[PDB]
């Protein structure tokens, strides 16, 4: 029992911190591990935490703070404030660690990626439509994506015109007792 | 993107941040397969050594959840956040 570094003396038995291990950047060597840590964490704390909790030796630690955008309390209403900043730490490992490659879109069915992709597309269109309106503009009728109701009225139009179908008056427009 | 991969040690401490060593996150159907939290009455029958050890078992579990939540969004794997908020 001997750590590669000099341990402190203030013992912490029940820490309430949440450490997040994030994927590295593409061109980063395999001896750099990036973590999201509490804003009150310091470089010495990460070294002790990684060794005594996960048994991971590090030769050096890098730390940088990420600021959050100023926002209104209720989005579009309320006083202007700024959320707490985020702190990321990059530890230099003694043993390399490589992350797996993200699954292919065809293999993400265990997460219901199909339904998630449809919902994501609809959300992207909604934010795009709002952006067009925020510019003081509208989508002309010529550029509306033809929906399934439009495709159905164009098919019938060809049937009545060709003679395949004979037009008849409606029968479910209103339920009158007279039926005339 | 075509170099021979290095041999990462199997007993690496950083493997404790992952649920599955192929997909950092766990499938939602398997992430919900868990029991309930301990009741104070059940914890009153445990010593400091157990409560001290049990505490850290909850810490490493929380760190494992946060690590999965971050990758699931960055990599756009799909759903699973609602299942993780209950587990957390």
């Amino acid at each position: 029992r001997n750590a590669p570094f000099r341990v402190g003396k203030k013992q912490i038995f029940l820490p309430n911190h949440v450490i997040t291990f994030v994927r590295p950047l593409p061109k980063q060597p395999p001896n750099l591990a990036t973590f999201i840590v509490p804003l009150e964490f310091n470089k010495l704390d990460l070294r002790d935490y990684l060794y005594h909790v996960y048994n991971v030796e590090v030769t050096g630690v890098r730390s940088f703070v990420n600021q959050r955008m100023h926002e209104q309390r209720h989005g579009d209403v309320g006083n202007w404030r700024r959320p707490k900043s985020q702190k990321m730490m990059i530890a230099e490992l003694a043993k390399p660690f490589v992350w797996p490659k993200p699954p292919a879109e065809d293999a993400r069915e265990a997460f219901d990626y199909a339904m998630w992709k449809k919902q994501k597309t609809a959300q992207e269109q909604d934010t795009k439509f709002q952006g067009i309106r925020a510019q003081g503009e509208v989508v002309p009728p010529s550029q509306f994506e033809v929906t399934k109701d439009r495709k159905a009225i164009k098919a019938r139009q060809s049937k009545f015109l060709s003679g395949e179908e004979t037009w008849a008056p409606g029968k479910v427009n209103a339920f009158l007792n007279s039926k005339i | 993107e075509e170099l021979p991969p290095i041999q990462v040690d199997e007993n690496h401490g950083l493997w404790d941040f992952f649920y599955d060593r192929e997909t950092v996150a766990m499938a939602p159907l398997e992430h919900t397969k868990h029991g309930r939290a301990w009741t104070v009455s059940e914890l009153r029958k445990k010593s400091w050594d157990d409560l001290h050890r049990l505490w850290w078992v909850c810490v490493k579990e929380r760190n494992r959840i946060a690590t999965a939540n971050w990758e699931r969004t960055k990599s756009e794997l799909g759903f699973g956040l609602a299942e993780a908020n209950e587990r957390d």
Partner: peptide, 29 residues
């Protein structure tokens, strides 16, 4: 079924809404 109240649910709740639409499609045939 709202666009925003669709992702904040679990696959359990979401899969039951898909099962309801499936039995509805079978009844129409």
């Amino acid at each position: 079924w709202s666009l925003f109240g669709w992702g904040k649910q679990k696959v359990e709740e979401r899969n039951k809404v898909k099962e309801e639409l499936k039995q509805s499609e079978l009844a129409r045939t």
